[PDB]
Amino acid sequence: GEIAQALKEIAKALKEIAYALKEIAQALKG
Amino acid sequence: GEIAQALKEIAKALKEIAYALKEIAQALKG
Amino acid sequence: GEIAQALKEIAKALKEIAYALKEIAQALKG
Amino acid sequence: GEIAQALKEIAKALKEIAYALKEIAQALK
Amino acid sequence: GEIAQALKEIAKALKEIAYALKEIAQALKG
Incomplete structure (x- = not known):
């Protein structure tokens, strides 16, 4: 969901x- | 609500x- | 609650x- | 719970x- | 002195x- 997506973009x-x-x-x- | 707002600021x-x-x-x- | 707060600090x-x-x-x- | 704690450490x-x-x-x- | 400082902070x-x-x-x- 949206938190997983936020965290993936932060890792990038x-x-x-x-x-x-x-x-x-x-x-x-x- | 609050989580949607937090996530909008993270995206910005x-x-x-x-x-x-x-x-x-x-x-x-x- | 806790998650909204955590995400606001991440946004900051x-x-x-x-x-x-x-x-x-x-x-x-x- | 666990996700709140993880995210607090990430914020720090x-x-x-x-x-x-x-x-x-x-x-x- | 700026280079020493920069490199220390980058390592951190x-x-x-x-x-x-x-x-x-x-x-x-x-």
Whole structure:
């Protein structure tokens, strides 16, 4: 239902945030 | 009621997150 | 009740995350 | 019950993530 | 000093993201 859907989209968002932050970490090491 | 409202705000928040992340991705390319 | 409250705190959290990420996007464009 | 408890922990986690991200924004700003 | 700070906070952020995702995975089994 709608709570399961909310949570799936939050998991997606958090995975993209983790990747964004790793690319920012690498940029700053560069 | 309250749960429908909470879920509408979650959906709004996640749309802004998706937008922000695209601009972060682009910034890091240039 | 409890679920509505939990989801309202999640909605708040995600709104602050969207805000933070917009400032990160701006920083990186500088 | 169990779903309310799970969602309270998720709310806490996301609040700490929002704080972290604001400190990252400031560092970079 | 900004780079040191950024990298410390990104490491913290990633640990909290991994935790959030585990709790979301478990929640969705329920």
